[PDB]
Subunit: 63 residues, 6 copies
């Protein structure tokens, strides 16, 4: 790999706006996984067998 | 790898705005995983078998 | 690796704004994991089998 | 008038509840009359020609 | 008028509850009359020609 | 008028509760009359021609 005058963006997250006015939430979780907010995961490389990259609201109950 | 005049962004998170006015939340968690806020995970490299990168609101109950 | 005139950002988090006006939260957690605030994790390299990088609101109950 | 064992309520206002959650108002008044709150006027007797009893949000510009 | 064992309420206001959570007001008044709060006027007798009893948010610009 | 064993309430205001949590007001008044708080006026008798009893947020600009 060789860059020359390269304005590169590679594995990036940007400009994620979020507004919320007059909200009323309520959660009742039992052993689960509830996710309500903003999530911004930026990666470039993930290796490995059986791996997990960027898991939001994930439940794993394998044997 | 060889860069020359390279304005590089690689595995980056930026400019994540979030506004919230007149909010009313309520959580009742029992053994779970509730996530409500802002989360910004930036990585570049993750190795390994069976690894987990960037897990938000995750429940793991393997055998 | 060899850089020349390289303005590099690599595994970075920046510019994460968050406003909140007239909020009313309430949490009732029992053995779980509730997360409500801002979280900014920036890394560059993580190795190892079975590792966990950047876990927010995580519950692990393996055997 | 003559009362005997008289549990009288005469010209009364009571039990006016009002709840308000996650409100966002805005008023831009110019020479007028804006009214937004609770108003409870209880009277029993008003006399007189040309009088005005219990005027809410009233504009009078006679000649 | 003659009362005997008379539990009288006459020209009364009572029990005016008001709750308000996560409010955001804004007023821009110019020569007018804006009214936003609770008002409780209790009277029993008002006489006179041209009088005004219990005026909330009133604008008078007669000639 | 003659009372005998008379538990009288006459021209009364009572029990005016008011709660307010996480409020944000703003007023910009110019020559007007803005009113935002609690007001409790209790009277029994008002006489006179051209009088004004219990005026909240009132603007008078007669000729």
């Amino acid at each position: 790999v060789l860059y020359v005058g390269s304005k590169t963006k590679e594995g990036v997250v940007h400009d994620v706006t979020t507004v919320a006015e007059n909200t009323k939430e309520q959660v009742t979780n039992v052993g689960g996984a509830v996710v309500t907010g903003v999530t911004a995961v930026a990666q470039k490389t993930v290796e490995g067998a059986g791996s997990i990259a960027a898991a939001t609201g994930f439940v794993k109950k394998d044997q």
